[PDB]
Each structure stands twice: as C-alpha cells, then as structure tokens.
C-alpha cells in the first residue's frame, strides 16, 4: 500500500516529512 | 452603341410597384423580389457581403426605393452626467459648452434635464433617484441662473433627437444619436427601437381638444419659462406649425399671465415665453402606446412613440 | 466538509456553497472608409486596359 510523503535523510535516520496545511484548509478550520 | 443598350438595361428597373399575385400559399419568387428589402448588417465573408450587397453605391443592391439611410451623430460626455440605465429610445438635448476647443460635449436627457430645473425650488422621485446629486449636473452649464434670468436658454440647446447605442465606458462615455433619418438600432439582431418620453412631462395635444387624419402626426418639444422654474413639455399633434403656434399659445394662456402677475417684466428680455421645435414625425395611427419604465426601485409611467422619424428644426418663439 | 471534534463547541453541520459567476460582454468595433470612386467602378464592368 503506497503512501505519499516526502522523505529526507539524517545520518542513520531516514525521516519522512508531511504537511497537513492542505488537509485542514480545505475544511476552513485553523491548522 | 450596343453597350449603351446594356447600360440602359443595368439602369432601367425601378422597385416593383404592382404585382398581380394569384394565391397566397404559393409564395412566388416575384412577390419575394417585391418584398425583399436588403439588409444592413451581415457576417464577414466576401460572398456574404456580396449577397448583402453593402458595397453598392449609396443604396443597397445585389450585383431610390423611397427609403432614407440614417445618419449617426457621435457625442462624448462625462460618465457622471449620464445614467447607463437610460432607455434606448429617449430624445437627447445638447447644451453647447462655453470653451472654444471642447471635444467633450454635454448632453441632457429629459430625466437629467429635469434636475437642472427642480434643484433651485413620481417623476421627480425618479429623477432624483437616477441622477442623485444635482451638483454633478449643475456645473456642466456654468451659469445657469443668469442664463435663465435673461431668457436665452433655448437658443443654446439644440435637440439632437433620440438615442441608439451607449457603449458603457468607464470615464468618457461615447453615445450615438440619430440626428436625422429612420431611427433604427445598430445591433446584430437589429431590434426595433421606440422613442420614450415620460408621461407626466408629455401631454397630448390631440385629445386635449377632446375628420382629416393624416399619416404623419409630428412630435413637438417645448421649453417654457415659468417663474416656478422652467419646464420641458412635449407635444403630439397632427397639425401644421402654423396651427401649432396658435394652439400652443391658447394652451399656455394661463401660464403667461401667471408669470406676468408674479414677476413684472422689468427688462426687455423676459418677454420671451419659451419656444418650440419640431422633433420629427411618426405614424399617426399607431402612435404613443403607453408602457412602463423600471429602475431598481420604482416605476414611472412613460409613453412610447414607436417607429419614430427624427427631424430637428430650430426654435420658433411661443410668445 | 468539516472536522468532527472531541471537545465542546457548537459544530457546523454539512456546509455547501453555491456560487455563480455571470458572463461579461465586450463590444469591440472600428471604422473604415471607402471612396465612392472606388465603389462605383467596382460595381461596373470595364472593357479597356
């Protein structure tokens, strides 16, 4: 099941990063 | 000399006056050729222009008819001096500005021309609704009060006839009015246009009298000078100008001694009791059907002179 | 759509917007002239070079 979020690399850690600004501003509640 | 025969063949045929039709449901080509009057506006193709025949000299003919082409005088006015909710068929009045090089003229419709009279002292409700501030119109004439006071207001305003097209510009509005000819619109569906004049400003002179009926009963404008502020009335009649001055004197017979009683004529120029001008002719049978005119709030009664033929004249003083 | 909440508020129900946009009109025009000496002889037939 593919998932959609950008991923950066930090040494040993490969942390993904996502933004939920779009996921709430379509519902007009403050992020 | 045989080419002259072909020239006289190209020059002979008049419009068809008589046509011995037989039945109505057949719709022969000959009766179509009688009734087909050429158009004025067509799509832009050289074959389409050729069938429309607009390239013919003077009058339209596919490679004279008792019909006249209309002229279209163009004007420029400031956007606040006019309301874009004016009707298409309404007569207009030019006021000549005092600058030598002008460019931008000053046109008054009778609704706007009303508030040059009321401020300084129904119909007036709408005239204050459309043109809200008189101060935006009190300045297009620079010296209104002095010009009323010496009674030379009528020879400064020449009527220009009815309106046709108002391209609603932002600042400098450009209007087109027919000074002369068959009043017909320049639209792609060429719709008919009916000249409107507001009902309270327009008194009939036929039924005011309450066998000879001609076809062309004219429409007269009349500026009158009252001590209660001057008035613009309109007149429909089927009479000659010789008759129109006498019957207008008898119609204005209360107002002349009204002005005589209130204001004594101290100088020699107050004695002019306004003037008249033929605005043109129309059909005496189907004339002056009533209608209604809505702005966003209200509705004044308004007459509709339909299929009007504009023809301005000068001013002949009532006395 | 909206978010549900766990805590207290007076929450909005299902909102639905209807918005309309009217058309404009633009009436562009210009004017050309054509001499009648170039229209009468256009509407004739010559036989001369």
From Swiss-Prot, chain A:
It comes from the Viruses. It is found in: Virion; Host nucleus. Homomultimer. Makes the hexons and eleven out of twelve pentons. Interacts with triplex proteins 1/TRX1 and 2/TRX2; adjacent capsomers are linked together in groups of three by triplexes, heterotrimeric complexes composed of one molecule of TRX1 and two molecules of TRX2. Interacts with scaffold protein; this interaction allows efficient MCP transport to the host nucleus. Interacts with capsid vertex component 2/CVC2. Interacts with the small capsomere-interacting protein/SCP. Self-assembles to form an icosahedral capsid with a T=16 symmetry, about 200 nm in diameter, and consisting of 150 hexons and 12 pentons (total of 162 capsomers). Hexons form the edges and faces of the capsid and are each composed of six MCP molecules. In contrast, one penton is found at each of the 12 vertices. Eleven of the pentons are MCP pentamers, while the last vertex is occupied by the portal complex. Belongs to the herpesviridae major capsid protein family. This is Major capsid protein. It comes from Epstein-Barr virus (strain B95-8) (HHV-4).
From Swiss-Prot, chain B:
Its main location: virion. Keywords: Capsid protein, Host nucleus, Virion. It is found in: Virion; Host nucleus. InterPro entries: Herpes_1. Belongs to the herpesviridae TRX1 protein family. Structural component of the T=16 icosahedral capsid. The capsid is composed of pentamers and hexamers of major capsid protein/MCP, which are linked together by heterotrimers called triplexes. These triplexes are formed by a single molecule of triplex protein 1/TRX1 and two copies of triplex protein 2/TRX2. Additionally, TRX1 is required for efficient transport of TRX2 to the nucleus, which is the site of capsid assembly. This is Triplex capsid protein 1. The gene is TRX1.
């Amino acid at each position: 099941v593919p998932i959609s979020a950008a991923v950066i690399k930090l040494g040993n850690h490969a942390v993904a990063v996502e933004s939920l600004q779009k996921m709430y501003n379509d519902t007009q509640s403050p992020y | 000399r045989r080419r002259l025969q072909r020239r006289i063949a190209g020059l002979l045929p008049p419009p068809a006056r008589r046509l011995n039709i037989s039945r109505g449901s057949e719709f022969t080509r000959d009766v179509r050729g009688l009734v087909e009057e050429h158009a004025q506006a067509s799509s832009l193709s050289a074959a389409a222009v050729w069938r429309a025949g607009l390239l013919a000299p003077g009058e339209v003919a596919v490679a004279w008819s008792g019909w006249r082409p209309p002229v279209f005088g163009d004007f420029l006015i400031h956007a606040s001096s006019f309301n874009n909710a004016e009707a298409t068929g309404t007569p207009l009045f030019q006021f000549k500005q005092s600058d030598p090089f002008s460019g931008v003229d000053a046109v008054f419709t009778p609704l706007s021309l009303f508030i040059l009279m009321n401020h300084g002292r129904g119909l007036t409700r709408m005239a204050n609704l459309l043109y809200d501030s008189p101060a935006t119109l009190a300045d297009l004439v620079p010296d209104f009060g002095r010009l009323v006071a010496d009674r030379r207001f009528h020879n400064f305003i020449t009527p220009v006839g009815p309106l046709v097209e108002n391209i609603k510009s932002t600042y400098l509005n450009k209007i087109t009015t027919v000074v002369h000819g068959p009043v017909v619109s320049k639209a792609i569906p060429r719709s008919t246009v009916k000249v409107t004049v507001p009902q309270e400003a327009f008194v009939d002179l036929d039924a005011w009298l309450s066998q000879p009926c001609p076809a062309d009963a004219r429409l007269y404008v009349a500026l009158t000078y009252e001590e209660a502020g001057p008035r613009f009335t309109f007149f429909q009649s089927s009479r000659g100008h010789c008759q129109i001055m006498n019957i207008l004197r008898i119609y204005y017979s209360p107002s002349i001694m009204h002005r005589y009683a209130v204001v004594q004529p101290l100088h020699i120029e107050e004695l002019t009791f306004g003037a008249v001008a033929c605005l043109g002719t129309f059909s005496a049978t189907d004339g002056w059907r009533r209608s209604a005119f809505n702005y966003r709030g209200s509705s004044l009664p308004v007459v509709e002179i339909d299929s009007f033929y504009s023809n301005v004249s000068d001013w002949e003083v009532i006395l | 759509p909206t978010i549900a909440h766990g805590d207290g508020r007076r929450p909005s129900k299902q909102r639905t917007f209807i918005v309309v946009k009217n058309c404009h009109k633009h009436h562009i025009s210009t004017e050309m002239e054509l001499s009648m000496l170039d229209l009468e002889i256009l509407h004739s037939i010559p036989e001369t070079p």
